[PDB]
């Protein structure tokens, strides 16, 4: 155990057991004209505001002190500077955990094992610029001798989630880039939709993996490969549809890609935290450099705020230890992400992968077992339609579910004269706010009077018609959703993960909960094959394969 | 609250804790040889086999007794007669519930307040046909004498994901159609995107919308009208472009619509259980009618299943009842469904408003106050990428999450004579089995000793390698993906939902805990005009108002 021992927790913890039950946020607002005032933090970028409004929560001032006293009291600040200065945190795989130095624009060195770093990552970004050049406007090598049209990744979890959310995010940018498609999964319906629509002469493939081992990516690549090699039936071709982000250039190599055409990263560079390393060369493509350097450079300005500034103000750190405070001592189990905004559809699904990948563990640094609840489960939907949806549960189910909405001030399509924004930022408003007040059974009661509802119908249909709010939202709103505000947005929920994951001392940088699928699945794969009823294992997987072999020929 | 009143369900409360013996997957299946076929059963539907196998859950005989005497104890087979009856079972607006009536092939009559549904019901289909067939044939031209390449439709909540989901699940029998869209957020962005790459006189618009009054249907639809209505001047023309789906004739009659361009569904219809109906017109459209047919089909087959089948052996019953045990006994909040097919990338969100919507409730069919848990939090994303964004929170994390696997014994594409589909099928089978075994200290230990590990290495990575394992999951397994398959399993989830819901004693077609948030969101949008700051709301909404008229024209 660890968190379970310190003080500040069990204070915190007593506190909510005693006072807890009280809190109710219409009560807070009514005797507090400076709740908004005390509970909020604007930040000034230089390049968009961005407001944290976090006053809709069951919070007081003692219960945000006890939560900040507690966050020190686990050493936040110091494995915050631990992190930015190299050192391995990443206890279990030995390695340092640095995808701020990706984004580090000020080029403050940063040194693993007496070597800094940012050489070595202006070297890669530098040739992804080069690269980006030569395929953006005509001038890159179509066996056939055509500029190149289309631009498809090739990878799967860190290497594609990333990638896909921020080109999606920010299509406004698109801006005389070529079309980018994202193929991952290992489902052959994947893949083949994709090269059904595509022209071999005018593709160029970009194979993203880390340890290019995987087994889909792989697979993938050597499918479209295939495919290519199919219309152009020269091998040594391949070097003109075919680039790499990767660490293993024996890999790279092996697989047809020539060692200059390899974009590479580092072992210090998390797959969940990549799309800022060369892995977001897909980014640069769709949106040109400017727009991703700036996508960068948002990141970092979030990376030095978030070193930079005291506790109490410190957005990361507030937004992480609010969800402590509804994890460890509500026992919330999710964590709702909604963005009203089409353009960032994929964004609560980014942070699935970005939070649980990190957060889903039970083992602490010091091999204890952990005796408390670590990450939530992250889901989400955008724009209003979650209110048609599923916020019917949030309102009137039975679960407390802390709610992230963000939204944009200003679109990137003010059509009709921005009616369709206000109505979307009406509805962004009205619902943190519905969620707060809700609806007494009086309030509730009144209106069925003016309705005419005889007293059978009334009562019949009364507490139906009432919501007990209190229900705890946080809102997050920025001037733009641009480059620089989104690279801000997501550098920003990686701390919060960062500080969760410190208070709970546990490693977020590993992924130890995905070998045992990956090794029973290679021991499944050749017993398939043939119609021999398998026995080998548990009568479920047996049962499973077996009625598979059975309906395999089937019609 | 008619459940924690019940005799049954109070055994089986008393039960899950009366005593030790805590179930344990692993030590079930290896003291059972009959496990599999003892919690387990194949649906022959003559058109595709569905295998549905429980055993990975924590039950024994004597649970699945437990558990089905509750179900009989809380009438869910009355209930289930009077929904099919055509009784009016949602109380709270005193509506019949009869989705099971748009797919009742057989046309056993089904009266509402002395009248047959199925002749109107069929008329609606009918018309269907006749206008699907115009179109796809090239018979229905716009006024330029172009036939018709694309349809939109705008819609949402029910009136946009069922079609959606279907559509994107269907694809294989896209078969000489359009190219069909789907609009329904609010956010400009979306509508704009669409029409960009839409020429007026060869789209069509599909306004989908039962009362045809919501907010973001109306102002799409409008934008749509007036964006058409710029190249083709003539507002005449509005009749050979824009069609309805809805109820309320006199509204569609408003838009500019033509009363015989409007087919028509019933207050009886639920919006997320309307994709039967009328409101499937783009499903016909993409795929034809055909296959649409066969979509309810399938589902009119589940359909008789649930009706006919004891409840010891009925799937919907049996789904239900597992997810009772993990909901009100062991206290799990969610419910995962995922999909290992790329097709059914959007299955999850539909039943995340399907399941949520309808169960996300607290007041009972009584007017008591629920005392006890009731819908889940759903939530899953498909394919193999799932093993690679959140599973590890699902092997390693601290919650406790039912899963539903689903996959397709045969793609829709072979490709690479069919090794794609081998790995995806392999990857299928072992999550769930390592799910249930997990991995020992022991054997991790075991492990680390092969490889050949340090004192040191191993020991500070062995416990991180430990898989605890017994993580209950549900497979389903089905010959192929087919319209008729399709729609068989997502009847089977609708009823599952349905039984949940009379278990609960809770009205599953209610949609109450939405009027708040677009009360209070009419109310705000006229307060958005203009610059002066607002005062009238709580600290929270004026802050997030004034930040916003603030950073309104900022560059
Ligand atoms: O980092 C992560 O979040 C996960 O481990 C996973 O998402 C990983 O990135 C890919 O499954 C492997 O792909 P690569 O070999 O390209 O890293
Ligand atoms: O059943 C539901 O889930 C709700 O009714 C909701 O999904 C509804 O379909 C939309 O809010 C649009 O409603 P209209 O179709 O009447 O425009």
């Given at each position: ?7 500040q ?10 006072h807890?039950?009280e809190?109710?946020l ?19 970028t230089?390049?968009?505001?961005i407001l ?11 219960v ?8 020190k ?26 995808h ?7 080029n403050?060195?940063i040194?693993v094992?007496?070597?800094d ?21 005509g001038?890159?090598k ?5 500029t190149?049209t289309?631009v498809?990744?090739?990878?799967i ?7 896909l959310?921020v080109?999606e995010?920010?299509k406004?940018?698109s801006?005389?880039?070529?079309r980018?498609?994202?193929v ?8 083949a939709?994709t ?12 194979i ?5 081992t995987?087994?889909?990516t792989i697979?993938?690549?050597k499918t479209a490969?295939?495919?290519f ?12 549809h075919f680039v ?8 790279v ?7 200059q055409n390899?974009?590479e990263?580092?072992?210090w ?11 977001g ?7 040109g ?17 978030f070193r930079?500034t ?6 990361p ?6 969800g402590?405070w509804?994890?460890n001592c ?9 963005p009203?905004?089409?353009y ?22 010091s ?5 408390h ?19 019917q549960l ?8 802390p709610?992230?909405?963000?939204i944009?001030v200003?679109?990137?399509?003010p059509?009709?004269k ?13 619902q ?5 007040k809700?609806?007494?059974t009086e309030?509730?009661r ?10 059978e ?10 919501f007990?709010?209190?229900r705890?939202?946080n809102?997050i ?8 505000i989104?690279?801000?947005?997501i550098a920003?929920?990686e701390?919060?993960?960062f ?5 709970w ?6 992924q130890?909960?995905?070998e ?15 119609s ?6 548990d ?9 598979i072999?059975?309906q395999?020929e089937?019609?």
């Amino acid at each position: 155990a660890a968190l379970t021992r310190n003080p500040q927790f069990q204070k915190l913890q007593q506190w909510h057991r005693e006072h807890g039950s009280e809190l109710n946020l219409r009560h807070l607002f009514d005797t507090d004209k400076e709740r908004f005032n005390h509970f909020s933090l604007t930040l000034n970028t230089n390049h968009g505001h961005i407001l944290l409004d976090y006053s809709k929560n069951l919070v007081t001032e003692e219960v945000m002190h006890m939560l900040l006293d507690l966050a020190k009291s686990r050493g936040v600040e110091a494995a915050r500077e631990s992190m930015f200065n190299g050192e391995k945190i990443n206890s279990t795989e030995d390695r340092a955990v640095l995808h701020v130095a990706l984004r580090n624009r000020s080029n403050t060195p940063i040194v693993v094992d007496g070597k800094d770093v940012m050489p070595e990552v202006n070297k890669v970004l530098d040739k992804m610029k080069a690269f980006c050049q030569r395929v953006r406007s005509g001038d890159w090598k179509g066996y056939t001798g055509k500029t190149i049209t289309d631009v498809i990744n090739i990878g799967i979890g860190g290497s594609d989630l990333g990638p896909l959310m921020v080109t999606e995010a920010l299509k406004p940018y698109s801006s005389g880039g070529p079309r980018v498609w994202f193929v991952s999964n290992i489902d052959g319906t994947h893949i083949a939709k994709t090269l059904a629509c595509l022209n071999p002469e005018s593709s160029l493939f970009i194979i993203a993996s880390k340890t290019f081992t995987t087994q889909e990516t792989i697979t993938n690549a050597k499918t479209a490969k295939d495919w290519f090699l199919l219309s152009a039936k020269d091998p040594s071709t391949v070097a003109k549809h075919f680039v790499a982000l990767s660490t293993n250039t024996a890999k790279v190599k092996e697989f047809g890609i020539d060692p200059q055409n390899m974009f590479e990263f580092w072992d210090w560079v998390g797959g969940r935290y990549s799309l800022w390393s060369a892995i977001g060369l897909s980014i640069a493509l769709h949106v040109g450099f400017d727009n991703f350097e700036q996508l960068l450079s948002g990141a970092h300005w979030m990376d030095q705020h978030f070193r930079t500034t005291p506790l109490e103000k410190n957005a990361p750190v507030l937004l992480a230890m609010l969800g402590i405070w509804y994890i460890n001592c509500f026992g919330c189990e999710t964590q709702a992400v909604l963005p009203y905004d089409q353009y960032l559809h994929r964004f609560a699904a980014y942070f699935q992968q970005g939070d649980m990948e990190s957060n889903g563990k039970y083992i602490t640094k010091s091999g204890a077992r952990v005796d408390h609840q670590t990450g939530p489960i992250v889901w989400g939907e955008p724009g209003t339609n979650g209110q048609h949806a599923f916020y019917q549960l949030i309102h009137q189910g039975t679960k407390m579910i802390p709610c992230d909405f963000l939204i944009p001030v200003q679109t990137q399509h003010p059509i009709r004269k921005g009616l369709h924004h206000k109505i979307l930022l009406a509805n962004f408003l009205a619902q943190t706010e519905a969620l707060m007040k809700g609806k007494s059974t009086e309030e509730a009661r009144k209106e069925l009077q003016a309705a005419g509802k005889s007293p059978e119908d009334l009562m019949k249909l009364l507490p139906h018609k009432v919501f007990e709010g209190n229900r705890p939202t946080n809102s997050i709103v920025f001037t733009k959703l641009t480059p620089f505000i989104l690279g801000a947005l997501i550098a920003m929920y990686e701390h919060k993960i960062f500080v969760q994951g410190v208070v709970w001392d546990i490693n977020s940088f590993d992924q130890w909960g995905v070998e045992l699928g990956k090794q029973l699945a290679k021991k499944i794969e050749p017993e398939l094959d043939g119609s021999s009823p398998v026995t080998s294992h548990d009568s479920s997987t047996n049962g499973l394969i077996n009625f598979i072999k059975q309906q395999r020929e089937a019609k």
